[PDB]
């Protein structure tokens, strides 16, 4: 709907008092917009008079109708998701009399890709974390943990469409979460999302369907989450190293997909390889990608 004339409509299940809101340091700042840490007097029900550590993703000043469009969408599609402990949750919102702020679980251990950076194996880099060094054990407990995310958010019958270690919050108790709603649909109803000619979605982690027949179904995410898994694999590591989106178009007609990572089995190279199968309705749901990884996890485990 048109943001510049558009009333955000009242709430109250979701409203926040921006009297109990104070903005703190801030966690983020994309392109889009721009997230602070704050303090949330009495947000969770069950300590009405203690404050909760909480982030506050808003507008900022040079913002753009998209920008706002954006934002309330992302608001909107986390009240209709439900609660996940792998999905970054929405706690809240102050959407009248002032700039809109949509308040959300904060996740202290910031974004997955420098999250795997920080813990790899011996550049010099002051931010790395050698006490918690990423084990194989730990790169697939993080990967189970997305796939059950996604998991749930497809059978909330949502398509999230920007799947990317990017977009993945970690927070203090290492836990994983799906976070950046704002370019998630709801397809209930309607058995594939139709894209328009050229997308917001980064193309190195976009399905074939996508890019070339401009559809989008719980398969594309699918394949999302395999570029996701390589990119956990390899530490962080950014996908189709070398190969400028310009010319991955051809490349992926061609049949072309990325290489095993260093510190992967075949076991699990041949998921991401299931996850890039040409034909959509040939790679695992998220409910199979959840059995196997539980499987494989349960074996490590032990």
């Given at each position: 709907?048109?943001?510049?004339?558009?009333?955000?409509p009242?709430?109250?299940?979701?409203?926040?008092?921006?009297?109990?809101?104070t903005?703190?340091?801030?966690?983020?700042?994309?392109?889009?917009?721009?997230?602070?840490?704050?303090?949330?007097?009495?947000?969770?029900?069950?300590?009405?008079?203690?404050?909760?550590?909480?982030a506050?993703?808003?507008?900022?000043?040079?913002?753009?109708?998209?920008?706002?469009?954006?934002?309330?969408?992302?608001?909107?599609?986390?009240?209709?998701?439900?609660?996940?402990?792998?999905?970054?949750?929405?706690?809240?919102?102050?959407?009248?009399?002032?700039?809109?702020?949509?308040?959300?679980?904060?996740?202290?251990?910031?974004?997955?890709?420098?999250?795997?950076?920080?813990?790899?194996?011996?550049?010099?880099?002051?931010?790395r974390?050698?006490?918690?060094?990423?084990?194989?054990?730990?790169?697939?407990?993080?990967?189970?943990?997305?796939?059950?995310?996604?998991?749930?958010?497809?059978?909330?019958?949502?398509?999230?469409?920007?799947?990317?270690?990017?977009?993945?919050?970690?927070?203090?108790?290492?836990?994983?979460?799906?976070?950046?709603?704002?370019?998630?649909?709801?397809?209930?109803?309607?058995?594939?999302?139709?894209?328009?000619?050229?997308?917001?979605?980064?193309?190195?982690?976009?399905?074939?369907?996508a890019?070339?027949?401009?559809?989008?179904?719980?398969?594309?995410?699918?394949?999302?989450?395999?570029?996701?898994?390589?990119?956990?694999?390899?530490?962080?590591?950014?996908?189709?190293?070398?190969?400028?989106?310009?010319?991955?178009?051809?490349?992926?007609?061609?049949?072309?997909?990325?290489?095993?990572?260093?510190?992967?089995?075949?076991e699990?190279?041949?998921?991401?390889?299931?996850?890039?199968?040409?034909?959509?309705?040939?790679?695992?749901?998220?409910?199979?990608?959840?059995?196997?990884?539980?499987?494989?996890?349960?074996?490590?485990?032990?």
């Amino acid at each position: 709907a048109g943001v510049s004339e558009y009333e955000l409509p009242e709430d109250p299940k979701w409203e926040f008092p921006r009297d109990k809101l104070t903005l703190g340091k801030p966690l983020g700042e994309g392109a889009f917009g721009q997230v602070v840490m704050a303090e949330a007097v009495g947000i969770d029900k069950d300590k009405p008079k203690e404050a909760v550590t909480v982030a506050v993703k808003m507008l900022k000043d040079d913002a753009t109708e998209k920008d706002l469009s954006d934002l309330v969408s992302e608001m909107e599609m986390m009240k209709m998701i439900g609660k996940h402990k792998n999905i970054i949750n929405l706690l809240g919102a102050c959407t009248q009399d002032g700039p809109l702020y949509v308040i959300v679980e904060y996740a202290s251990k910031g974004n997955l890709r420098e999250y795997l950076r920080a813990r790899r194996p011996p550049s010099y880099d002051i931010n790395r974390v050698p006490e918690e060094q990423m084990t194989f054990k730990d790169l697939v407990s993080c990967t189970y943990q997305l796939a059950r995310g996604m998991e749930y958010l497809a059978s909330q019958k949502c398509i999230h469409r920007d799947l990317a270690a990017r977009n993945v919050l970690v927070t203090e108790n290492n836990v994983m979460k799906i976070a950046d709603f704002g370019l998630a649909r709801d397809i209930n109803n309607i058995d594939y999302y139709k894209m328009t000619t050229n997308g917001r979605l980064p193309v190195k982690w976009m399905a074939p369907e996508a890019l070339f027949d401009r559809v989008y179904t719980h398969q594309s995410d699918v394949w999302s989450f395999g570029v996701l898994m390589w990119e956990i694999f390899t530490l962080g590591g950014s996908p189709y190293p070398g190969i400028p989106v310009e010319e991955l178009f051809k490349l992926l007609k061609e049949g072309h997909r990325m290489d095993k990572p260093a510190n992967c089995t075949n076991e699990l190279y041949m998921m991401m390889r299931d996850c890039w199968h040409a034909v959509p309705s040939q790679r695992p749901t998220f409910k199979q990608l959840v059995e196997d990884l539980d499987r494989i996890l349960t074996l490590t485990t032990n």
